[PDB]
Amino acid sequence: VKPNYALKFTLAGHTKAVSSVKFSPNGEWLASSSADKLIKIWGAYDGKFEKTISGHKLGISDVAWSSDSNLLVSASDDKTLKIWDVSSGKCLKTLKGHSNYVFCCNFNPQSNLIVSGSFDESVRIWDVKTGKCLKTLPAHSDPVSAVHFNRDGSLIVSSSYDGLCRIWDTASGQCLKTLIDDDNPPVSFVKFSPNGKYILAATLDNTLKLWDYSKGKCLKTYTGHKNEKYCIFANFSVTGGKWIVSGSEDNLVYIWNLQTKEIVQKLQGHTDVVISTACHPTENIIASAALENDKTIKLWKSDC
Template structure:
């Protein structure tokens, strides 16, 4: 595509699909979980507003944090370690096999909300709410670089180079070469930047903003290739984004429960769907993901709905019910993992929408999760101050 094709569009260059009326098929799978089913033999108690579950399906529990654990990531190279960050202003790098601490990432000024390994596990990045970002050598545990921005919203590594990205509450996002710190800044148009996704080509990044708009940026030139704004943008803050495998489609969710599908080639909005599946309450879509083996896109919302949406007709294919809000979803092949405010991790079949498995153990909401494909393990962090390891190979208790 020629460079001119990526310019900022006038309003008449866009054509938005009409709002879709959801048509629920009678055979749509709707699973309901009664509160008494959350514990063993229906036992569920309440203690200081936290769930107390009399069952633990995890193979390992990491307990070094003294407050809520907001973020977790695993090292993609050796697959031997986890990094976790929490409200206690600390991050730990620790061993997957036994939970022993390799090193402590200290010196943060506020809650550590972002933790990421570089693509080759050479570096670990940790970022706190105040905007202090630190990079550590995985081998030695020594801090090798740091930088202070405004309040931090997100943090991610390039998937093929030692390049770090961060988005901030003042609307700018940054790109640094690590460890020398060579920097490039991508300017704000006003609102904060809330989420981002680096495309597989490593040359473009999709960014969502607090005003509901979306931009596709060219990293080399620091120019945006399109800007979805105005009536074509979300009406509330963009919360999450994902891109399909052939880089043609961008899915974005918002605080008011709307899923938008945008063409990555020209920035035209192809669909707008009421994905929260309810009309009141907390509708925010917290996570969105494409499925690699089916023509569907997935949404998880605080309404407790996991929606499996057909990309062909943009209608609901399966609706998966949770007793509480969904905080994050991951899709691996035909498997969908959903993390929930009830502290339970669930596994769903993407084709049928059936719940195939549940892992209990957390006594408070799950806030983040990471999946190790080769080890078939899921790591979940929680408000209960722990990180747990769940294995697909191990039977639930």
């Protein structure tokens, strides 16, 4: 079985490279952040432009939804994170304390905490209600490329250009495990599988790997794409067939069979690097987004 994703919509409106796209957990909306300092909200099913959210002084590298779909957090080159009320577009809180560009961010499942990663090589945990920093983890010795909570928020996984993935106990701040692999290629993205048992990690040697967290073992490798320069988001697609989805520096979206590691589709249509992909939580829908020469988001639909 292979998917048959086909282009349904192209979404335009950002005036610089798009950095990140995410579907709201309730399936209604797509949020996009951009080097143009703006967040935009789009209808998930029709691509209809809904609204622009502004306030960052410099470009945004990541955006993420709270679990009730009511809040967003954005990570900006202005060295802050901002928490936004989606329906009003208002900035509720500005999270200050990183001493360099903020690159990546995520809510925990309860959405009372935000985790962030920065070029200052640290990971920070923030209280959503007050906006205060709760913990700083001296997590890495290079920029932190990705941070992600597991399914019940008890663990954080962080990745870095230093070649490490590290799993942290959220509450105690203690590093429980470090994944190290051979020649230490920079790690550009990382995230837990939906069941919390595996970690998908992208490295800047054109490689994606699926690790068993408990055993510290690489179980699967996925190749064929180009990824040497950018921190490209990758996903587990679970609504239909079990795929791995990623962008690529050859302007294609790659879809792999998770178990066999075979490439099952390449989505063509972007005209610059596909920096970001997202999978819809209930439909077989992929959103993809691309850099300066393109600046658009594409929505793709499959029957499986």
